[PDB]
Amino acid sequence: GKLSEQLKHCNGILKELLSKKHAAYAWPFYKPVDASALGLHDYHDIIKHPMDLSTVKRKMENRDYRDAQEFAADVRLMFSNCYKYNPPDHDVVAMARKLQDVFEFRYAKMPD
Numbered sequence: 001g002k003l004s005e006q007l008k009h010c011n012g013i014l015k016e017l018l019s020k021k022h023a024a025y026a027w028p029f030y031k032p033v034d035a036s037a038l039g040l041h042d043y044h045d046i047i048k049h050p051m052d053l054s055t056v057k058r059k060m061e062n063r064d065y066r067d068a069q070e071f072a073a074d075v076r077l078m079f080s081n082c083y084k085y086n087p088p089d090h091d092v093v094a095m096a097r098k099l100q101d102v103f104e105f106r107y108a109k110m111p112d
């Protein structure tokens with residue numbers, strides 16, 4: 001069906017975001033932000049819905065996502081959290097921008 005086909009395209013995108021090709025700028029998004037470890041004691045006051053690629057992978061593997069839009073909402077939530085919390089001149093924001101470029105251009109090629 002169409003939903004399964006579109007979810008395969010999403011899974012392809014997810015595999016690419018986690019691939020060695022993008023590791024130089026994708027790595028801050030591989031696991032949940034460890035606020036305590038990074039000394040970010042305001043992170044969970046500012047970010048109400050944390051998201052990261054390991055959580056997206058778990059949800060895909062668990063068949064949590066019912067459509068491509070639900071998958072895209074979680075990937076974009078992850079980038080939005082980064083843009084909300086971090087100063088715009090921080091390296092992690094430059095890395096988010098680069099990984100979101102990879103995501104948006106491939107997401108746009110979604111099969112209809």
Ligand SMILES: CNC(=O)c1cc(C(=O)N[C@H]2[C@@H]3COC[C@@H]32)cc2c1OC[C@H]2c1cccc2[nH]ccc12
Nearest residue numbers: 027028029033038040082085086087090091092095
């Ligand atoms: C999604 N990840 C994050 O939002 C994130 C934030 C901070 C972080 O410290 N953010 C505070 C700035 C100033 O105060 C508010 C905000 C640090 C890191 C983050 O992921 C990996 C970690 C990291 C450690 C070493 C070098 C790095 N280069 C780029 C990131 C990075």
